[PDB]
Design a protein around this nucleic acid. Structure first.
Ligand SMILES: [K+]
Ligand SMILES: [K+]
Ligand SMILES: [K+]
Ligand SMILES: [K+]
Ligand SMILES: [K+]
Ligand SMILES: [K+]
Ligand SMILES: [K+]
Ligand SMILES: [K+]
Ligand SMILES: [K+]
Ligand SMILES: [K+]
Ligand SMILES: [K+]
Ligand SMILES: [K+]
Ligand SMILES: [K+]
Ligand SMILES: [K+]
Ligand SMILES: [K+]
Ligand SMILES: [Mg+2]
Ligand SMILES: [Mg+2]
Ligand SMILES: [Mg+2]
Ligand SMILES: [Mg+2]
Ligand SMILES: [Mg+2]
Ligand SMILES: [Mg+2]
Ligand SMILES: [Mg+2]
Ligand SMILES: [Mg+2]
Ligand SMILES: [Mg+2]
Ligand SMILES: [Mg+2]
Ligand SMILES: [Mg+2]
Ligand SMILES: [Mg+2]
Ligand SMILES: [Mg+2]
Ligand SMILES: [Mg+2]
Ligand SMILES: [Mg+2]
Ligand SMILES: [Mg+2]
Ligand SMILES: [Mg+2]
Ligand SMILES: [Mg+2]
Ligand SMILES: [Mg+2]
Ligand SMILES: [Mg+2]
Ligand SMILES: [Mg+2]
Ligand SMILES: [Mg+2]
Ligand SMILES: [Mg+2]
Ligand SMILES: [Mg+2]
Ligand SMILES: [Mg+2]
Ligand SMILES: [Mg+2]
Ligand SMILES: [Mg+2]
Ligand SMILES: [Mg+2]
Ligand SMILES: [Mg+2]
Ligand SMILES: [Mg+2]
Ligand SMILES: [Mg+2]
Ligand SMILES: [Mg+2]
Ligand SMILES: [Mg+2]
Ligand SMILES: [Mg+2]
Ligand SMILES: [Mg+2]
Ligand SMILES: [Mg+2]
Ligand SMILES: [Mg+2]
Ligand SMILES: [Mg+2]
Ligand SMILES: [Mg+2]
Ligand SMILES: [Mg+2]
Ligand SMILES: [Mg+2]
Ligand SMILES: [Mg+2]
Ligand SMILES: [Mg+2]
Ligand SMILES: [Mg+2]
Ligand SMILES: [Mg+2]
Ligand SMILES: [Mg+2]
Ligand SMILES: [Mg+2]
Lengths: 117, 201, 144, 64
RNA sequence: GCUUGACUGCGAGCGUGACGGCGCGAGCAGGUGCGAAAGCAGGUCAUAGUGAUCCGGUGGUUCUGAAUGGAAGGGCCAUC
RNA sequence: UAGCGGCGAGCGAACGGGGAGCAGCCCAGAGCCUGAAUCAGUGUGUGUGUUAGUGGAAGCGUCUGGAAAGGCGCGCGAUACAGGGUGACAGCCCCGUACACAAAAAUGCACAUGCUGUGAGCUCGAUGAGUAGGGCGGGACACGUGGUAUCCUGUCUGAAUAUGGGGGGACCAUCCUCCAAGGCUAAAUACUCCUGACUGACCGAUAGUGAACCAGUACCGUGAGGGAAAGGCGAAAAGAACCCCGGCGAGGGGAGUGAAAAAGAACCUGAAACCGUGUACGUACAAGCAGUGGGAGCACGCUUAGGCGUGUGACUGCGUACCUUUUGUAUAAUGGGUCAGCGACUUAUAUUCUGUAGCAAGGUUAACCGAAUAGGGGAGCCGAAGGGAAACCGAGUCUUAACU
């Protein structure tokens, strides 16, 4: 029962090389190099599903800070004020409102300031 | 336990142990596998590094050439080299305990009765050693793929069945577990049933 | 019941280990041998009873005893064997004929093991105190 | 082929009813005058092979 | 001063060792010494003073004894 | 197992049992008697095989197609549906196959009866000497000199010879058993350079022979010796008339053949590395494992016209390959230029444990017989009893004079 490897080996190599499309040089052409590139791409993608959540929160906070300071209050006081006012709107939504509805954002700041006063 | 004869319409009495027992799949499986293992010829070989034709000269010196170290041109790493674990001829036959063999046959025969695949007749024969006669007889009986078991194997029936690939004609002593399962129907003469009864008990 | 509807019993056919076929198997690379040393090697490992060079147990302990040739030609008969002979007389030859003892056995002893429930004459065998009581209680007799 | 008994082990161990092994004690061959009678008396009866050593003995005596 | 307990067979139980081993031990049987007796004595205030197995030697022995009776050799106990 | 054994590593019987097969004779010598038994060489009939051969059943229509053996329909043979071939897969087209037959000549074999040599039967007698045995040295016996029987003999010796002699594992006695120093002998057993037939959970061109091919060749070596690579057009050569560019080239474009010519002989399929042409997008102020998360712009598709898809990826967060070996490696430690193909826990037997199946105080057979995967075969093996070094005793036994 001699087994030739060619058909299965080809399919495995092609599966990896397909995942390496777009990579530079040997990384999209050469199995040995492409395999390492694909594993590393997977490692980074795993890491960066966690980092994405950090990076977006960082961005939302920076924008809330800018919008809050245009309305005469720091980010840190603003968040404290909203919590004392029992407002549960999260940072993704606050940052969205900061950009797209300036008047509504001002109303949130006034709510925060009233809770602090 | 009784089996009605199709031609005669009598009632042949048989033991519950042989023809009425439960199907033991695990036991039957072992015996069927053993039977197929018994059919293997097991004739093959490859050449180890000892058996490949060539010199025992070391291909190049141990050190200094910048090549991987080599010892034999017959190394299994090398093209044209030996097979690492070269096959030899093997005996693939298994032991089947006598009682497990007999137990498997009783399970099979009992299951053929439950599935209405065992057909008992008083007699089964042909006038002349003519395939056309047996082919017509099986057409009359609504049989196609059939194992025919006789008490004594007729020469006319043997010769008539030989060129029909769907049909096989055996004596009762020449039953085997795979053949009872493989054919769609099993026709037994009354005399064959008694010999099989006596054989298995 | 067809050749493609038979299965083995659950648990009856465990798959063999295959070493050195990659990470996922759990036996890749070193094949369960660990790292280096004599035991990792092809043909590697020390002989039976070897303890690293310390005088091994089977040499630091003394030899004792001798083997008796008489023991090899002496058998024990159970009470349950007494009924297995043909014709109700138990002696060496009838025990040999019944395949109870080997043909080269020259001496035999009936012991209190199992039961005797029939009258048996025992001739030319030793019998234990307990076996004698059991044989005599079943209406048997013992002849030296 | 058949496993070969370690013949030196067969001269030093005998299998008991529950599958342990009896052996003769060491230290009662010679240099006996200096040994207390108590010590020698306790070395006379046969002893059982310890748990740690059973694996070694069993390997040596496959037909015990 | 009188003595041979520096006893023989055993040993509940325990300590210490990977193991081989080593250690402590009331008490039981037999026979003993000392003392008036209770009692004590199985070496020495204790902890070093030691060498496995093999091979063989010596003495003993209700064991074995290659046709049988013996014997040789072997075993077992003591010891080198 | 018993034993042997620096009692180490290891070596390893026999007795006895079950089978296959089976067969007994002659000389060491005269007599009587005829040449009776039977083995060889040389004949010649009788079969029976071998070396060429002979006959050997039964199918058409229609659909797809380059082609039908395929599909569909309706028939027929089968002691033949083994197998091979034929323009795709054929019981019925071809070659076969089952079955039935055949030899002028040579020849194996088996019996038959000649001739030639060979002599059986019977009674009486005989019964293997430099031998057995020994001393010395060595070797062989499972047995290593050991308490070492037995066998062989290089060396030195040396019996009794049937009222005798050998052996029974030191040795002696007793008893039993056999007759050395002369020889022949079928079968069961071993093997395959070679011939025929058939088979394979054997390989399928880096495999399988080293060798599918003009291979023990080319080639290497003074020589012994070493020793490759290399298979496939198509159903059929129908292997491309003729024309055109070119050197009366190479190579190509047409034409033609063909089902197909990116089947055109550098020929089935035609992967990958590697190298190009074309198009989209990015890229000449920008620093590092080259990705990943975010992300504009552009191009091209789709179209609830909201968006989506595909390619690209400005800019930006994070981010020092893999294997190995290590306390620890981005490591400036190891290994890999890349791709494709191959390349490493197997096999046999024994043994123990687990799972599972059978049968159960029983379980199971080996060789072998059997045409038999059956059935027979229970020789054996394991288990149902242990204790003791052992004799031995035995649900106990050993220890000890004897056990609380
Ligand atoms: K048939
Ligand atoms: K392991
Ligand atoms: K006392
Ligand atoms: K057709
Ligand atoms: K055909
Ligand atoms: K001589
Ligand atoms: K004699
Ligand atoms: K070669
Ligand atoms: K080759
Ligand atoms: K980036
Ligand atoms: K290192
Ligand atoms: K280095
Ligand atoms: K196993
Ligand atoms: K099992
Ligand atoms: K006891
Ligand atoms: Mg293949
Ligand atoms: Mg590519
Ligand atoms: Mg090869
Ligand atoms: Mg059988
Ligand atoms: Mg692991
Ligand atoms: Mg390693
Ligand atoms: Mg290490
Ligand atoms: Mg290790
Ligand atoms: Mg090696
Ligand atoms: Mg028997
Ligand atoms: Mg001693
Ligand atoms: Mg105790
Ligand atoms: Mg020695
Ligand atoms: Mg004797
Ligand atoms: Mg003798
Ligand atoms: Mg002695
Ligand atoms: Mg024909
Ligand atoms: Mg084709
Ligand atoms: Mg003679
Ligand atoms: Mg002699
Ligand atoms: Mg001599
Ligand atoms: Mg001699
Ligand atoms: Mg000599
Ligand atoms: Mg010698
Ligand atoms: Mg010796
Ligand atoms: Mg003698
Ligand atoms: Mg001789
Ligand atoms: Mg080749
Ligand atoms: Mg190919
Ligand atoms: Mg030359
Ligand atoms: Mg062709
Ligand atoms: Mg041209
Ligand atoms: Mg083709
Ligand atoms: Mg091609
Ligand atoms: Mg630009
Ligand atoms: Mg600048
Ligand atoms: Mg720029
Ligand atoms: Mg740069
Ligand atoms: Mg993204
Ligand atoms: Mg960075
Ligand atoms: Mg280091
Ligand atoms: Mg690091
Ligand atoms: Mg560097
Ligand atoms: Mg490096
Ligand atoms: Mg290194
Ligand atoms: Mg390198
Ligand atoms: Mg016992």
């Amino acid at each position: 029962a001699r087994v030739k490897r060619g058909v299965i080996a080809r399919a495995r190599h092609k599966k990896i090389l397909k995942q390496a499309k777009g990579y530079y040089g040997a990384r999209s052409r050469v199995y040995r190099v492409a395999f390492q590139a694909v594993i590393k791409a997977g490692q980074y993608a795993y890491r960066d599903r966690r980092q994405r959540k950090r990076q977006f929160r960082q961005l939302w906070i920076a924008r809330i800070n800018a919008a809050a300071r245009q309305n005469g209050i720091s980010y840190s006081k603003f968040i404290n004020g909203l919590k004392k006012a029992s407002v549960e709107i999260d940072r993704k939504i606050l940052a969205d409102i900061a950009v797209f509805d300036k008047v509504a954002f001002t109303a949130l700041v006034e709510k925060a300031k009233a809770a602090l006063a | 336990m009784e089996l009605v004869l199709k031609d005669a319409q009598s009632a042949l009495t048989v033991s519950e142990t042989t023809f009425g027992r439960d199907f033991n799949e695990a036991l039957v499986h072992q015996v069927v596998v053993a039977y197929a293992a018994g059919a293997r010829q097991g004739t093959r070989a490859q050449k180890t590094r000892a058996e490949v034709t060539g010199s025992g000269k070391k291909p190049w010196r141990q050190k200094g050439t910048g090549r991987a170290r080599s010892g034999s041109i017959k190394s299994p790493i090398w093209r044209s080299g030996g097979v690492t674990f070269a096959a030899r001829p093997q005996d693939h036959s298994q032991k089947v305990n006598k009682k497990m063999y007999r137990g498997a046959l009783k399970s099979i025969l009992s299951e053929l009765v439950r599935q209405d695949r065992l057909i008992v007749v008083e007699k089964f024969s042909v006038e002349a050693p003519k395939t056309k006669l047996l082919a017509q007889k099986l057409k009359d009986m609504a049989l196609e793929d059939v194992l025919i078991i006789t008490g004594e194997l007729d020469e006319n029936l043997f010769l008539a069945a030989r060129n029909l690939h769907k049909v096989d004609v055996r004596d009762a002593t020449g039953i085997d577990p795979v053949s009872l399962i493989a054919f769609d129907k099993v026709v037994m003469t009354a005399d064959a049933v008694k010999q099989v009864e006596e054989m298995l008990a | 019941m067809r050749l493609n509807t038979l299965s083995p019993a659950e648990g009856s056919k465990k798959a063999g280990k295959r070493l050195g076929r990659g990470i996922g198997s759990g036996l890749g690379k070193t094949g369960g041998r660990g790292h280096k040393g004599q035991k990792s090697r092809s043909g590697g490992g020390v002989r039976r009873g070897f303890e690293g060079g310390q005088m091994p147990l089977y040499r630091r302990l003394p030899k004792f005893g001798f083997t008796s040739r008489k023991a090899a030609i002496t058998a024990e008969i159970r009470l349950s064997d007494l009924a297995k002979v043909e014709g109700g007389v138990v002696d060496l030859n009838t025990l040999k004929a019944a395949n109870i003892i080997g043909i080269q056995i020259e001496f035999a002893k009936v012991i209190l093991a199992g039961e005797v429930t029939t009258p048996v004459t025992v001739r030319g065998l030793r019998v234990t105190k307990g076996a004698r009581a059991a044989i005599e209680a079943a209406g048997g007799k013992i002849e030296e | 082929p058949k496993i070969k008994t370690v013949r030196g082990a067969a001269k030093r161990f005998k299998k008991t009813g529950k599958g342990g092994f009896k052996h003769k004690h060491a230290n009662l061959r010679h240099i006996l005058t200096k040994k207390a009678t108590k010590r020698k008396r306790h070395l006379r009866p046969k002893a059982m092979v310890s748990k740690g050593d059973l694996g070694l003995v069993i390997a040596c005596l496959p037909y015990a």
